[PDB]
Amino acid sequence: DTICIGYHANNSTDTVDTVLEKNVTVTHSVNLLEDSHNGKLCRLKGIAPLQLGKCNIAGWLLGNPECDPLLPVRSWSYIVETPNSENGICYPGDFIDYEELREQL
Amino acid sequence: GLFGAIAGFIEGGWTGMIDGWYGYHHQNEQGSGYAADQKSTQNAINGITNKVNSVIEKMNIQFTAVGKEFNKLEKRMENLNNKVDDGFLDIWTYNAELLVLLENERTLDFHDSNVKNLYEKVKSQLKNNAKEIGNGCFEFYHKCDNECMESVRNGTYDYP
Amino acid sequence: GLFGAIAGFIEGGWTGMIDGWYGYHHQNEQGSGYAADQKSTQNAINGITNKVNSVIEKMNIQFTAVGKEFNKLEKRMENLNNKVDDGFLDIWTYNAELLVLLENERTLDFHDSNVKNLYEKVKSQLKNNAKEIGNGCFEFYHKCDNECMESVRNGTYDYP
Amino acid sequence: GLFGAIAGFIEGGWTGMIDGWYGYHHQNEQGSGYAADQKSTQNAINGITNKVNSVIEKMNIQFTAVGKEFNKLEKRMENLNNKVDDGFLDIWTYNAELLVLLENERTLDFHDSNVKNLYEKVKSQLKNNAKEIGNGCFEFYHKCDNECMESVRNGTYDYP
Amino acid sequence: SMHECNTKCQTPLGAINSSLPYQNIHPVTIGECPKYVRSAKLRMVTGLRNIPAR
């Protein structure tokens, strides 16, 4: 008849960093950091975004002929461009207060 | 650790406990086995759950944050926007990593504390009925049953 | 708590102790009453006064901060101003709610430590000439007066 | 401090110790000398070196921070620039003095912890062969060699 | 690419569907997302130090 006080252990190879020691092996832990994403553009609360695609803001708003598929788009939850959003202004000059117009939109 | 139980006088943790974070390995003549202390386990779990809640609750959700575009004669207000976005991101990353090092240490201090508070609680019951033998292990003078072991678990065993 | 005296080995605090945060109860033949331990009370008050000073004096007073005006073609510098004010207020509320929850737990740990440092100090003075009984209380072996009971308070009584 | 060993039960530190932060002093028939307990001192030096590295690592080196001119009709954007520069410098000065006061308290508590861990490992080892005198000093009941004092440093000591 | 998925948070790389307080995917966000930080590990301990005694 003996009685021994002790603490828990397991097979858990979880690790955490402290001020005293880095990568201390621990029985349980959870990550507060997120790294997972769908890899996809998705609907924001059941409503689909506008995808400008081959066009930018200025080609849609002026109604550039290469941006005619974007002219019937009434509503969106957010607006998306791509790295190849080159179909904008189709005759040279300048767009006065462009930076403010996309900020309104 | 800090208080001196976790890798301290108690040499290692036992995989025979799965029921809780703190427990008693009884070694009766009626048979050996492990039995977790539900009090120190649940007090630790409640304190950990409130720490897990607190760190997530203080992190109020990030809303829609989009990049601002500026023209060729707006390089200063671009570098002000860059300085603002970088300088906030530095502070949020810095507070996130600083708190993680501090709270992981304070949690290991807290668990070492809970083994110590449990050890002294059992020692104050086994006064002149037992001697300390294995740094956690007590050896009884009169040999008592699994009922008398459970009396030591639940906070009774008032014997001299 | 952490140190295991406040709601730990001492079950509750006395409402007859008002003179200091730490002290002693009389249970001698010369009658009951309370006498405060001024050294544990004052060192706790000094630590509390310095942490109260620290948390206030680190916060250097806010000068005049007023709203800024923006026309219909200045919505970018309006939303940059707003992002700066909101992002600073997020960090400020976050640092304030970190400090208050952390340092309230450290204050409980600090006071719980001062009850340990007092109890172990009286145990090391009393030794065999008094034994622990009422988890805080010490039964005198040979028995002695309120002068001898006072001598334990002031840091003398070096009797085996 | 927070564990009652440094400035507590041991009255003061020894200037004859130079070998380490925690150590013993024997008074054998073989003579006297200060000899550090290596394992506790080195573990403390690792804990201090890791915190010293961490607080230097967590800040990232300040790149080119150059002042920006604004004309007579851009004084709002100068007051945005100045508010951003001041508000970041406020927060970073507050973070620096926060972690200095907090971690300097935790350092003294950590060393005080390591001195009580050094005393309690010797108390649990010497057991029935020695009593307390100067609170830290252990008069033996059998008189054993400086080899047997080294057996208390490494923590073997084969006699109950 | 756009798909018939739904979410509470979008980024330029893809849609996050999590309740964790921080993220490290992209600073640009739409809807209610976790806080962007440059961290690679913000793992908090819930248990004690694992010492299996094996």
Convert chain B into a string of H (helix), E (strand) and C (coil): CCCCCCCCCCCCCECCCCCCCEEEEEEECCEEEEEECHHHHHHHHHHHHHHHHHHHHCCCCECCECCCCCCCCCHHHHHHHHHHHHHHHHHHHHHHHHHHHHHHHHHHHHHHHHHHHHHHHHHCCCCCCEEECCCCEEEECCCCCHHHHHHHHCCCCCCC
Q: Give the three-class secondary structure for C49.
A: helix
Contact C6, C111 (CB under 8 A): yes
Long-range contacts of C95-99 (CB under 8 A, 24+ apart): C95/B95, C95/D91, C95/D94, C97/B58, C98/B58, C98/B95, C98/B99, C99/C55, C99/D98
Q: Which amino acid is at D119?
A: Y
| CB crowding E6-32: b at 16 or more within 10 Å, else e | ebbbbbeebbbeeebbbbbbbbebbbe
Q: Give the three-class secondary structure for E50.
A: coil
| CATH code where residue C26 lies | 3.90.20.10
Distance, CA of D13 to CA of C154 (rounded, Å) = 24
Stated resolution in angstroms: 9.0
Residue C94 to residue B99, Cβ atoms within 8 A: no
C-alpha distances (whole Å) from B98 to each of A19, B102, D51 are 9, 6, 11
Contact B101, A18 (CB under 8 A): yes
D75-126 and D146-153 helices, crossing angle to 10°: 140
Q: Tell me the chain D residues in contact with residue B101 when contact means C-beta distances shorter than 8 Å.
A: 54
Distance, CA of B140 to CA of B128 (rounded, Å) = 9
Contact A59, A51 (CB under 8 A): no
- Put simply, whether D137 touches C (Cβ < 8 Å) is no
Residue of D94, D109, D112, D137 to mutate when probing chain C, most C C-beta within 10 A: D94
Tell me which residue has tokens 């006699």.
Answer: D159
C-alpha distances (whole Å) from D10 to each of C63, C82, C111, D14 are 49, 57, 21, 10
D75-126 and D38-57 helices, crossing angle to 10°: 170
**Which chain C residue has the Cα nearest residue D98?**
C58
Residue A48 tokens read as 């689909």
Experimental approach = cryo-EM
Partner residue opposite C110 with nearest CB, options D2, D9, D84: D2
Tell me which residue has tokens 């980024």.
Answer: E11
Residue D61 tokens read as 């080196």
Residue D108 tokens read as 């003294």
Distance, CA of B110 to CA of B128 (rounded, Å) = 30
- Put simply, whether D50 touches A (Cβ < 8 Å) is yes
DSSP line for C100-135: HHHHHHHHHHHHHHHHHHHHHHHHHHHTTSEEE-SS
**Residue D107: which domain range?**
1-160
- Put simply, whether B152 touches A (Cβ < 8 Å) is yes
CB atoms within 10 A of CB C53: 10
Residue C27 tokens read as 């249970």
| CB crowding D9-32: b at 16 or more within 10 Å, else e | bbeeeeeebeebbbbbebeeeeee
Contact E25, A37 (CB under 8 A): yes
Length of chain B: 160
HSE at residue C65, side-chain half, CA atoms within 13 A, is 14
Tell me which residue has tokens 């006071």.
Answer: C111
Q: What is the 3-state secondary structure (H, E, C) of C19-41?
A: CCCCEEEEEECCEEEEEECHHHH
Tell me which residue has tokens 């033998």.
Answer: B133
Q: Which amino acid is at B144?
A: C
Taking only residues 5 to 64 of chain A, the set having a beta carbon closer than 8 angstroms to any beta carbon of chain E reads: 7-17, 24-46, 48-49, 51
DSSP line for D70-100: --TT-HHHHHHHHHHHHHHHHHHHHHHHHHH
Distance, CA of D121 to CA of A71 (rounded, Å) = 81
Question: What is the tally of structural domains in chain B?
Answer: 1
CB atoms within 10 A of CB B108: 24
Q: Give the three-class secondary structure for D130.
A: strand
Q: Which amino acid is at C69?
A: E
Give strand pairing partners of A46. none
